[PDB]
Scaffold this motif. Structure first.
Motif, short mmCIF file in Angstrom:
data_model
loop_
_atom_site.label_atom_id
_atom_site.label_comp_id
_atom_site.label_asym_id
_atom_site.label_seq_id
_atom_site.Cartn_x
_atom_site.Cartn_y
_atom_site.Cartn_z
N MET A 133 -2.97 0.40 -9.20
CA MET A 133 -1.52 0.54 -9.07
C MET A 133 -0.78 0.40 -10.40
SD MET A 133 -0.53 -1.22 -5.24
CE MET A 133 1.33 -0.67 -5.38
N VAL A 189 2.55 5.15 -5.27
CA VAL A 189 3.45 4.01 -5.10
C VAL A 189 4.19 3.72 -6.40
CG1 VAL A 189 3.68 1.61 -4.35
CG2 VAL A 189 1.76 3.00 -3.51
N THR A 207 1.41 -3.44 -0.03
CA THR A 207 1.96 -2.10 0.14
C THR A 207 2.51 -1.87 1.54
OG1 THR A 207 -0.29 -1.24 0.48
CG2 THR A 207 0.65 -1.06 -1.75
N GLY A 208 2.15 -2.76 2.47
CA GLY A 208 2.64 -2.66 3.83
C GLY A 208 4.13 -2.97 3.82
N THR A 227 5.44 6.26 -1.86
CA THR A 227 6.03 5.01 -1.40
C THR A 227 6.92 4.48 -2.50
OG1 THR A 227 4.26 4.41 0.13
CG2 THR A 227 5.61 2.62 -0.76
N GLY A 228 8.22 4.44 -2.23
CA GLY A 228 9.17 3.97 -3.22
C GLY A 228 10.54 4.57 -2.99
N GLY A 267 -3.28 1.67 -2.77
CA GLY A 267 -2.72 0.62 -1.94
C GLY A 267 -3.62 0.31 -0.76
N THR A 310 -3.40 -1.57 2.17
CA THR A 310 -2.89 -1.34 3.52
C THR A 310 -2.74 0.15 3.81
OG1 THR A 310 -1.63 -3.42 3.49
CG2 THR A 310 -1.04 -1.80 5.18
N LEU A 311 -2.25 0.90 2.83
CA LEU A 311 -2.08 2.33 3.01
C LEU A 311 -3.43 3.00 3.26
CD1 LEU A 311 0.50 3.11 0.21
CD2 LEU A 311 0.93 2.52 2.60
N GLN A 337 5.97 -2.63 1.17
CA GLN A 337 6.55 -1.55 0.39
C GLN A 337 6.77 -0.25 1.17
OE1 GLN A 337 3.75 -1.97 -3.16
NE2 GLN A 337 5.70 -1.76 -4.25
N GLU A 338 5.77 0.16 1.94
CA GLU A 338 5.90 1.39 2.71
C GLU A 338 6.96 1.25 3.80
OE1 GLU A 338 5.52 4.21 2.41
OE2 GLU A 338 5.35 5.23 4.34
#
Lengths: 447, 446
Positions: A288, A315, B104-105, A352-353, A239, A241-242, B107-108
């Motif tokens: 992903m 994720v 994913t931002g 994440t989920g 991910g 952003t992560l 999502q997290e």
């Protein structure tokens, strides 16, 4: 049956190995009884208010040369070796050592820690004026040194009103000297920087507790794993952003400083990679949806012994692999399989989920944990743990081991100690002669 | 089974309530399908990548004019009215509306919100470049307007990379205009100011979640109590340290600078008092060991109509009273029993102590809650609620129900079908059915 007494020697014989004198008498006489306590080389905690700075300063300096501890006047709370002193709370056992120049500040800080799922070793009160410009933080320095030498106290948390320049500077350096993760709470004071070496700054009680628990969880795990050989961090994220947040977070922990080809961070051989970047997706599906690339890279770490820590994001949800955890596990096991004992590969993952996503959060997490992969709830913890693991590991105060109390002032304190079934002898003391009922009756009535 | 179609005709006839076109076709064709969707007044979500800024701006500006929404190219995630779009997660229903120019931002943030026990109304993806200088936050503004009009979205949370100055100003202003508690997360951006009116700035995903949930709890409790008449806050504290922090926190919330006789705060009739001060302890036991005085003062509030909120701390443990809750409730009830219905007194308490203390934490909280006193886990929340309870006082069709015409990838339609969401899959391709070789060529190159 509480063992009451009325003479010092009588208390010292009923409790040969007494360790602490808890004084709660009328302020005017507290200092006197404190020195009488020190004459018998006993540690002192003065719950008593109405004591002069001069006497406090005299008692604390004298306690220093004697190598004893005087929890300065107007100290409403302390909890040493599970022993409740004055206004204390029953706390779960833990690895956090608390020090405070506050009454309910310590209590709330501790209440928040427990509420947050952790525990304490001791909660050492110092007296509201210890951090004053005139006292110089004598007791605060002695408290820090004691816990510093207390191995069970892996994480330190300090709480007091903001001290003046020269004093806070002396306290911080002292906190740095312990070398232990420490949270410095200076009530109602937005600190300059959030962190300084091993010192984390907070401005509110529950913010401080949240921080103390985080440091507690990271240090706990790091001590359990007991890393011995240094290496580098490798973050394989799916991910974007992560990957970027983990990068920013890790850079801060490392005091390191526009990110080409998915390489989010590359400092001192530590790397945080966004496998989602086009640079890694030519001719192949997004990481992903298809774990093949990442999993292979993971397995191949088996051939990169210098890589000590593997950071991962998992994720789930619609659009993702059916059961990422399992193949992640097999893949990292192959890696570990190829490593020599002195070249282990620690894995850290964040998930994440949700619980109701197809893959199911709880089942995914369990799969990772059962295999030995560390799963933490947030990136700050994941990266802090990673940074902690790359640097391998490098006489506890007798008062912190056992506490025997000669209670002088209020009987209720001796009684509450009786409840905790802790060694206590109650020294009934009074400023009025035994037969002077008039004055005794008067003092009581006025109070 | 999955309804499959080959023309817009069929799609719309089969899905008469179609609301959105989820497009995942090859980028060079995404804008064209997007305009065809707009020709039919349908909202658009382009998961599809490889779309030019030029087409993005054309599509979004056109959408804005039509009162519709185009979730920018390269939007991998969204959940609207319970409908998972592309890379989405199954989320519990809650009072937080999320907006993000991140995959994913979003999502997290949601994953964290769910873990904290809260839920969302929707999570609107905008497209990675929506907040850029060229685009200007077109979709960001729309989404904000939509959630601002959605009653169920009581708290808002926005997440994106730090937008350039002009864009950022425009965005923050729109957030201020909604009036709703809002958390603005500009990834890896140190905010100088932590709060600006109804906007709370955050730096990390977990912090943004923590704040969004805090505002969620406060706003939910306030809307439940449904205050009608404004009034004053009166804090009666037994613990000195707690009084000052409470005072400091409330002064911030009330945006005002705040020492003597235990009067930690006294501005605009709002007061935070430390009853443990010498000024209140002459001739009597400390308020932590004897509740008499405080209970008296609480009871006396029934005669003071203007006092709307009462803040309290309850410290248990070895040295405190044997059952604080019991006496507090009693004095509390007397006050309330003296107030007219139009002049209520709301109580808020924070409890300091553990489950193992003699008084037992949970036991005390129960007695307090049973009598209608609101118990919260921290002073920031208590003081925030205190300030929220002294004021006091249609929904976009897309946020009501979503019906999707899926065009690119089939997996997205199956995803919708499994969740029993209205869908129709528009089987589409760049190559006409009659050209076998060209079709082979494409199939092979992909």
């Amino acid at each position: 049956a509480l063992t009451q007494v009325r003479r010092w020697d009588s208390a010292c014989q009923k409790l040969p190995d007494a360790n602490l004198a808890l004084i709660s008498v009328a302020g005017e006489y507290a200092a006197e009884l404190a020195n009488q306590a020190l004459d018998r080389n006993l540690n002192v905690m003065m719950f008593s208010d109405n004591v002069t700075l001069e006497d406090e300063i005299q008692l604390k300096t004298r306690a220093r040369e004697k190598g004893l501890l005087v929890m300065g006047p107007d100290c409403g709370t302390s909890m040493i070796a599970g022993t409740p002193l004055a206004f204390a709370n029953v706390m779960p056992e833990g690895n956090i050592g608390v020090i405070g120049a506050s009454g309910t500040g310590i209590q709330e800080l501790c209440s928040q820690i427990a509420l947050a799922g952790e525990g304490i070793t001791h909660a050492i009160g110092l007296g509201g004026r210890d951090l004053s410009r005139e006292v110089g933080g004598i007791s605060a320095l002695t408290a820090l040194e004691m816990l510093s030498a207390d191995e069970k106290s892996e994480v330190l948390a300090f709480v007091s009103k903001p001290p003046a320049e020269a004093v806070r500077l002396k306290i911080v350096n002292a906190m740095k000297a312990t070398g232990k993760p420490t949270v410095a709470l200076f009530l109602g004071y937005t600190p300059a920087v959030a962190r300084d070496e091993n010192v984390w700054f907070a401005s509110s009680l529950d913010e401080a507790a949240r921080l103390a628990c985080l440091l507690s969880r990271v240090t706990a795990r790091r001590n359990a794993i007991a890393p011995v050989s240094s290496g580098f961090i490798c973050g394989l994220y799916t991910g974007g952003t992560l990957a970027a947040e983990a990068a920013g977070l890790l850079a801060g922990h490392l005091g390191v400083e526009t990110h080409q080809h998915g390489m989010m961070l590359d400092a001192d051989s530590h790397q945080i990679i966004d496998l989602g970047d086009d640079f890694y997706t030519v001719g192949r599906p997004h990481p992903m949806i298809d774990p093949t690339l990442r999993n292979q890279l993971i397995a191949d770490l088996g051939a990169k012994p210098q890589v000590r820590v593997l950071l991962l994001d998992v994720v789930i949800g619609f659009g993702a692999t059916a059961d990422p955890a399992a193949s992640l596990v097999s893949a990292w096991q192959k890696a570990c399989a190829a490593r020599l004992d002195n070249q282990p590969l620690y894995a850290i993952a964040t998930v994440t989920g949700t619980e109701r996503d197809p893959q199911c959060r709880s089942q995914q997490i369990a799969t990772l944990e059962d295999a030995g992969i560390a799963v933490v709830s947030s990136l700050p913890e994941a990266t802090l743990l990673a940074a902690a693991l790359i640097h391998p590991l490098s006489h506890t105060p007798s008062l912190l081991e056992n506490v025997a109390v000669i209670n002088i002032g209020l009987r209720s304190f001796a009684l509450e100690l009786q409840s905790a079934s802790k060694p206590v002898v109650h020294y009934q003391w009074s400023p009025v002669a035994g037969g002077n009922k008039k004055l005794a009756r008067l003092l009581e009535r006025l109070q």
